[PDB]
Amino acid sequence: AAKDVKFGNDARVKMLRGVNVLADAVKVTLGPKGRNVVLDKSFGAPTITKDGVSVAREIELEDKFENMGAQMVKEVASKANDAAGDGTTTATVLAQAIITEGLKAVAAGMNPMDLKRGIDKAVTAAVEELKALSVPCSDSKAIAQVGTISANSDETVGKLIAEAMDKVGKEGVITVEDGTGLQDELDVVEGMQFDRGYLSPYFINKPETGAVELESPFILLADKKISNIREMLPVLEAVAKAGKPLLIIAEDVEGEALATLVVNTMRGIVKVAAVKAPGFGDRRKAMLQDIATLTGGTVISEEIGMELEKATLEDLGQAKRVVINKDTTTIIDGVGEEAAIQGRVAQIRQQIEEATSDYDREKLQERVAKLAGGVAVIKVGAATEVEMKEKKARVEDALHATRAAVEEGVVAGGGVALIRVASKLADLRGQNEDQNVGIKVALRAMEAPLRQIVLNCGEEPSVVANTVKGGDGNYGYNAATEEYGNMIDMGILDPTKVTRSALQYAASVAGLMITTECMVTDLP
Amino acid sequence: AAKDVKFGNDARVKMLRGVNVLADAVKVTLGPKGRNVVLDKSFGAPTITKDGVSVAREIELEDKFENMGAQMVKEVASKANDAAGDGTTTATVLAQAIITEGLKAVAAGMNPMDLKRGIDKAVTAAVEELKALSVPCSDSKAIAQVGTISANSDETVGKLIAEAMDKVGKEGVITVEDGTGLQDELDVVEGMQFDRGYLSPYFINKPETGAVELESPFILLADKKISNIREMLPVLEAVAKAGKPLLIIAEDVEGEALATLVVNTMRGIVKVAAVKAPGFGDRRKAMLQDIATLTGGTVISEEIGMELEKATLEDLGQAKRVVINKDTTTIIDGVGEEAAIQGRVAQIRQQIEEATSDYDREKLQERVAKLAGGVAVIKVGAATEVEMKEKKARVEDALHATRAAVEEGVVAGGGVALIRVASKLADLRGQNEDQNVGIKVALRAMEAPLRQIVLNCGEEPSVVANTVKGGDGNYGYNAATEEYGNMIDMGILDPTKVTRSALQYAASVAGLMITTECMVTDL
Amino acid sequence: AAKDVKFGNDARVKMLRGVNVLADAVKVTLGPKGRNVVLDKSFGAPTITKDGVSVAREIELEDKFENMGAQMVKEVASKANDAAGDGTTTATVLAQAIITEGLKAVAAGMNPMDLKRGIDKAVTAAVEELKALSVPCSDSKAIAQVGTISANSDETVGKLIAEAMDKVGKEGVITVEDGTGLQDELDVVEGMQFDRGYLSPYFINKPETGAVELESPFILLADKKISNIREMLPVLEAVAKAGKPLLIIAEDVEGEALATLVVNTMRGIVKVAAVKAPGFGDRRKAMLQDIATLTGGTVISEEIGMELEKATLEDLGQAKRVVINKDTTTIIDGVGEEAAIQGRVAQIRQQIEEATSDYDREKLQERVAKLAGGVAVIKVGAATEVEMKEKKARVEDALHATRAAVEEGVVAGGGVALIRVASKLADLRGQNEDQNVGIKVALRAMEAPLRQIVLNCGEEPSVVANTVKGGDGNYGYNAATEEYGNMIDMGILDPTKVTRSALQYAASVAGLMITTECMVTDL
Numbered sequence A: 001a002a003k004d005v006k007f008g009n010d011a012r013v014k015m016l017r018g019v020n021v022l023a024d025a026v027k028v029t030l031g032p033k034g035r036n037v038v039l040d041k042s043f044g045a046p047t048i049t050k051d052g053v054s055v056a057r058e059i060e061l062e063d064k065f066e067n068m069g070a071q072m073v074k075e076v077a078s079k080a081n082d083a084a085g086d087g088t089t090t091a092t093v094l095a096q097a098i099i100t101e102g103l104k105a106v107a108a109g110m111n112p113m114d115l116k117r118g119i120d121k122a123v124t125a126a127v128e129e130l131k132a133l134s135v136p137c138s139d140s141k142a143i144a145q146v147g148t149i150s151a152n153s154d155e156t157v158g159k160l161i162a163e164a165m166d167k168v169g170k171e172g173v174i175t176v177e178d179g180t181g182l183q184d185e186l187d188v189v190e191g192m193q194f195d196r197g198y199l200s201p202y203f204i205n206k207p208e209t210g211a212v213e214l215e216s217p218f219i220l221l222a223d224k225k226i227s228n229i230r231e232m233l234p235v236l237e238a239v240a241k242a243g244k245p246l247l248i249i250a251e252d253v254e255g256e257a258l259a260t261l262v263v264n265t266m267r268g269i270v271k272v273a274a275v276k277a278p279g280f281g282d283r284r285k286a287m288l289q290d291i292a293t294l295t296g297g298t299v300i301s302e303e304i305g306m307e308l309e310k311a312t313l314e315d316l317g318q319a320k321r322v323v324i325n326k327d328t329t330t331i332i333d334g335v336g337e338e339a340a341i342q343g344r345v346a347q348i349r350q351q352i353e354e355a356t357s358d359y360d361r362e363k364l365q366e367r368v369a370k371l372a373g374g375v376a377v378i379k380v381g382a383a384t385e386v387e388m389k390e391k392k393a394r395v396e397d398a399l400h401a402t403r404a405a406v407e408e409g410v411v412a413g414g415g416v417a418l419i420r421v422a423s424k425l426a427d428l429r430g431q432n433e434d435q436n437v438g439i440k441v442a443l444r445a446m447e448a449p450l451r452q453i454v455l456n457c458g459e460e461p462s463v464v465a466n467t468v469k470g471g472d473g474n475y476g477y478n479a480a481t482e483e484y485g486n487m488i489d490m491g492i493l494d495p496t497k498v499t500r501s502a503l504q505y506a507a508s509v510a511g512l513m514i515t516t517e518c519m520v521t522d523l524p
Numbered sequence B, C: 001a002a003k004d005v006k007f008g009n010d011a012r013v014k015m016l017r018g019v020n021v022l023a024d025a026v027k028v029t030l031g032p033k034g035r036n037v038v039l040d041k042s043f044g045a046p047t048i049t050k051d052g053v054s055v056a057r058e059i060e061l062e063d064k065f066e067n068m069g070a071q072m073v074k075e076v077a078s079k080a081n082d083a084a085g086d087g088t089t090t091a092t093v094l095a096q097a098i099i100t101e102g103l104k105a106v107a108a109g110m111n112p113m114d115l116k117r118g119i120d121k122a123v124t125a126a127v128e129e130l131k132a133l134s135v136p137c138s139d140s141k142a143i144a145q146v147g148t149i150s151a152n153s154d155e156t157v158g159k160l161i162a163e164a165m166d167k168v169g170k171e172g173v174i175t176v177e178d179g180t181g182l183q184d185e186l187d188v189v190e191g192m193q194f195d196r197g198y199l200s201p202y203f204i205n206k207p208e209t210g211a212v213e214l215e216s217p218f219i220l221l222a223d224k225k226i227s228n229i230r231e232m233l234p235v236l237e238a239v240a241k242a243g244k245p246l247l248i249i250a251e252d253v254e255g256e257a258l259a260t261l262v263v264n265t266m267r268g269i270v271k272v273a274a275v276k277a278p279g280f281g282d283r284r285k286a287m288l289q290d291i292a293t294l295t296g297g298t299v300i301s302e303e304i305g306m307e308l309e310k311a312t313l314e315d316l317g318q319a320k321r322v323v324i325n326k327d328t329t330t331i332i333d334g335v336g337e338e339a340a341i342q343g344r345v346a347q348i349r350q351q352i353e354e355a356t357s358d359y360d361r362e363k364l365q366e367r368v369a370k371l372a373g374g375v376a377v378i379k380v381g382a383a384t385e386v387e388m389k390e391k392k393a394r395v396e397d398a399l400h401a402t403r404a405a406v407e408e409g410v411v412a413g414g415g416v417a418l419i420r421v422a423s424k425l426a427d428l429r430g431q432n433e434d435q436n437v438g439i440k441v442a443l444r445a446m447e448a449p450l451r452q453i454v455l456n457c458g459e460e461p462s463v464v465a466n467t468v469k470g471g472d473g474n475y476g477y478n479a480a481t482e483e484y485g486n487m488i489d490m491g492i493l494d495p496t497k498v499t500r501s502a503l504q505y506a507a508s509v510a511g512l513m514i515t516t517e518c519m520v521t522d523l
């Protein structure tokens, strides 16, 4: 359709007004004293949230140029949530401050391209200084503090996430889901815990629990679906000769074969039980082979060539314990070679590195946590649905912050890290004066997270920013108690990945936005 | 007519929005780095001003509740201008800060009238501490610096005011008028100044200042009261064609014989005005004879017997300029005869030597002081009329500030004195907790002039205010050079009267107006 | 009423948009290649003008903020026209350039008051360098070239003004009026000129120039002042039908009762005017007698004894034309008797020879200079009324430029003098960096007249400006022939007063108005 075209300072003012609207919506949540934002949902109750990415996503303005500004600065929070999962509010606070100060220098006649080059140089040096300033975060108390701070100073969430990471180890996978109670519940599972139940209700060895218990059972892995008892009849006879129980992981055991095997189960000759193979095509085979590696067995398939008729006891897998139930199944201490397990771990890690999709990579990480280590599920307990959503978002942010802490390290929180970085970058210079001014607006905008935290606390941002800049090291401002001290000692830690990602994405988008002169939108 | 009524928080936020609009329009002019405001006038070209009271008076909002708030804060600037002539922007800034903090405290559930009592107690104690903190102008001797600071850091205006007050004395009358060239001029000429008032409000000239001016005025003097119009009709007829506006100095004139007939007869080509005669009886005759001898005229008396019909144009006196104001009427330059003026001066000096009673001696020393001091006139030199108006307003502000400085004293400028008196009152407590919070509101709002000065400088008001409060004494923040130092040493001095009046009027209106729950206006 | 208030950049860009509209409408007329502007008038046919002040005065915008900006820049052209009479377009162009560059520097975050101080310092130094650069104008060819350049390169107007100033002297009075024919006619007739102004503002005629004119006026002279109306009512009765407008020259005229009574009695059929007489006492009587003998009339005096009622139509004087302005009143042609005028001239010259006092000799030789010079009346010959108005405005501009040239001096035309004085001030520095940027803004805006002249020529202003700045002295760019050369040699001379006044008034208003953060207007 027809277009409205704005040029120069008019377009810059409209875009900055949109950025200010989005950033003022976002930044009322920053810090521990930050407040919540209600987002109207056309389907369901409104969402009360303290995370900046949701309130950034929900912002869309009537003025098309202001809507441009809002969308472009919303990209900052979207990217910061995609990469680190935390610091979206900090990223938007940084992006707004670079844009306002960058447009001040743009209105001062300085070249926006050179300003963007200066911002990029300053933020590259800032990332280097953050990496130098960072301390690795491996101990449990530091992780608990990171999870607490990232969850609006909720010590319960931080300690629960610290315990979960301690339980599942470094290779473990932790996810957050809703709970039925009012309290946070941690559910840690070990070994293979694929979510398929028994094909028939009659396998139950323990009727008082509905769970089949198999002590040191054999494990058959059929990559094909079976409906006749003929094929594994030699295997069934060999198992009956051995006398140990047998568990089948197959694509489908149904009809005739299933009926005869449950009949043989209640006859007592074989304590057999069959369950469906997990996943779907191109994924079922890989983690079926993972189960085989864990249990020291081999998968029976037509592609690999051997049939169930020539399958023997050596072909079948081995574990010390097997638990069947309605929804899932647990295999405890599969008898497999350790070196093969680590080789499979390395292979799936290489697949993770080669994976360019979040879904495939997260499935591979889940498989790694299944075969090695454990899986933790955090049930968010809340009296109401809106508190469930708010607490779930906070726990997710805390989990992402703990993951970023172990990935890259921690720095002093509350924006003190960016303050120290900007203080260290005082002598950085560009190629010309416009680049130096861009560096200076980048350094000044690194004070924006601390200033906005103090503004949310109700104190004076200038006084506290100058006081923190006067101090050295991790000395900073406790925004909850409104005091001063070594931010590490008071447990206010920020993930280096979160702060660095927020700074980088804010700098990139903000430089691209201050470089603009003309904006072309649709007419109202 | 039909009334729109708002209650509680709705009325309070509407009123505070009006306060904020007026106070922003005023506060953009505070400090040396403050900017100008253009006021559109249907009279002529728009006027550029750095004066707070002009911007405040020109503000009127469309929303009736916001308009009520704007008018009520405009009262602050108007009262500050009437009482001191300077600090209207400071008064408006202090008023807005008190209103904002007091309304925050009202929203905090606390009693607004106890807040008002606390503000009043805090400002009474601050006035006491400002009187204690004040340095007399004789001890300071910084009239040039005070005039420079009040003229937006213009050293020429301060130097001119200092020279005028050195020539005609600290109590001498100084009058600001438009010059002809591009440069300011100082002329100490023989003149008269008497604290008397014009009679009927239909004599106001084209300027809106309320003081009428006359170009080469005719002077008529009388101690007895006229009995009929036909007695003084030829005299008016004598001024009917003679190109000198008639100023009549008599005891007291009513409107029935003069004002109504001169309104009906005359459309206003030449301003004819009458004034009261200061003193009574022998004193009235004495100053009438003195003014007649200044202007070369004569005084008609019953004992003399010479009537106004026999009076001619040459017999009556003539001046070069006369400015009539309600507070004080001045004759800038009466020619007369210099030898006659000197002889009259010597005669009154010999009368001083002869006289011995305290009242006669003091009134006669007042006469000789008025004669010797004369009138100092400052010609505002500017290239254009808008520059003329702006520079005239700045010189008038400098004159008012220097007069307040010699009358009351001087303190540290740039809101530093208010910072100091707020620091000295941290121990002050009211009757209850609400009064204590009102005291804290007043003390926090006393920092507002400095913070607004810094905001106009573009720096950080919190950092500068905390640095100044960390210091003691005249330590403050030079906003012209953006750096700290002893405020007296760098010449940034504020009149004690100006600061005290701004604080008092802002506190009074703001404390009265934070106690409002309901607001009633038209629709 | 209700006020719309704008702040900061919004108010600044609205005001600058108004400035740009007014300045474009004015600037399309700059230079020899500049075009005309048609102004619609409610009284009749539209007027075509190349004069900047007419276009500037007629500009009024619908948007209130833009209208305020337009009025403030209209002040520049009005002041330039009132002072010099030429360079209104140059003044507006310089004003707009200073406003644009200063607002750019304000958007650059810098202090606008320091920018204003820098602009004022730079323009003061430029005025000094223009006084140094000025060459005294003591050539008839220089007068002709100044008149030609100021009349849009019309050599006939320049030659006519040169002949007039050669005939009546460089200090003689020259009056421009309409001519019946299609050609300009220079007539050096015997006339009177005295620097006096009218009293009653009602006496302004149908033309809006502020000067009244009379067709074959009756002359009345007086050294004493009458008392009642009845002393002059019969004369007012006689002139009531006499066919000649009654001009009265008394000692000190006033419309205290004359103006209102003549307003009530007369609706405006024929103008009646009263003006002051120059001098006082014996000197006033001397010039009154001289004017009476020039017009063949008599002066009423108490010593002489002859009264107004005694005087008849034949006894009192009569003239052919009288033009009354506030600055100076002229009697273009008082017939009287030629032999009587010659005898009076001889007697007054004999009075010079007899007198030995310096003041007496100088006033008597002023009398004979006024008598001998007379009035040089220029008849504007044009085929139509709109052409008559345009050519009359051009001749008036040429006259004002020649007056400013013989008063102050001449410099290179076409903005070259401003280019040179901007080049000489590249070393000038202010108190701080913001004042330096204001100085640079003023210096860059001093190139604006030349750049706008080139833009009206259609060539490239940057190339021509850089070529001129590369040169030195009177080297400049002849815009009539679109080629470079010595500005003085090809006769493109500008008055020093015109350029200096344009620069000063533009600088004053622009420096005052780039310092504005808030603007308050109606809704």
Ligand SMILES: Nc1ncnc2c1ncn2[C@@H]1O[C@H](COP(=O)(O)OP(=O)(O)OP(=O)(O)O)[C@@H](O)[C@H]1O
Binding pocket: A029, A030, A031, A032, A034, A050, A051, A052, A053, A085, A086, A087, A088, A089, A090, A091, A149, A150, A151, A152, A153, A397, A412, A413, A414, A415, A449, A453, A477, A478, A479, A480, A481, A492, A493, A494
């Ligand atoms: N008690 C505290 N004292 C000081 N700083 C704190 C405190 N608690 C949190 N912070 C700081 O608050 C900043 C941001 O907190 P918050 O979690 O609300 O924002 P965010 O991570 O930017 O937002 P989001 O979850 O939308 O990505 C961090 O830099 C953190 O160090």
Ligand SMILES: Nc1ncnc2c1ncn2[C@@H]1O[C@H](COP(=O)(O)OP(=O)(O)OP(=O)(O)O)[C@@H](O)[C@H]1O
Binding pocket: B029, B030, B031, B032, B034, B050, B051, B052, B053, B085, B086, B087, B088, B089, B090, B091, B149, B150, B152, B153, B397, B412, B413, B414, B415, B449, B453, B477, B478, B479, B480, B481, B492, B493, B494
């Ligand atoms: N160089 C300076 N440094 C610091 N403060 C200054 C300086 N010059 C002036 N001030 C302060 O700024 C104020 C003067 O501002 P301004 O004269 O514009 O307004 P005002 O005094 O409130 O009154 P008004 O607007 O009626 O003239 C005073 O408080 C004075 O002490």
Ligand SMILES: Nc1ncnc2c1ncn2[C@@H]1O[C@H](COP(=O)(O)OP(=O)(O)OP(=O)(O)O)[C@@H](O)[C@H]1O
Binding pocket: C029, C030, C031, C032, C034, C050, C051, C052, C053, C085, C086, C087, C088, C089, C090, C091, C149, C150, C152, C153, C397, C412, C413, C414, C415, C449, C453, C477, C478, C479, C480, C481, C492, C493, C494
């Ligand atoms: N032939 C020419 N070559 C170069 N410059 C010229 C020439 N003729 C005139 N000028 C210049 O152009 C200007 C005259 O233009 P114009 O008379 O239209 O406007 P102005 O002087 O600004 O005043 P106004 O519009 O009030 O008459 C002067 O600066 C003069 O020096």
Ligand SMILES: [K+]
Binding pocket: A029, A030, A031, A034, A050, A051, A052, A089
């Ligand atoms: K947040």
Ligand SMILES: [K+]
Binding pocket: B029, B030, B031, B034, B050, B051, B052, B089
């Ligand atoms: K002010």
Ligand SMILES: [K+]
Binding pocket: C029, C030, C031, C034, C050, C051, C052, C089
């Ligand atoms: K022109």
Ligand SMILES: [Mg+2]
Binding pocket: A051, A086, A087, A088, A089, A150, A397
């Ligand atoms: Mg967060």
Ligand SMILES: [Mg+2]
Binding pocket: B086, B087, B088, B089, B150, B397
């Ligand atoms: Mg002031």
Ligand SMILES: [Mg+2]
Binding pocket: C086, C087, C088, C089, C150, C397
């Ligand atoms: Mg011209």
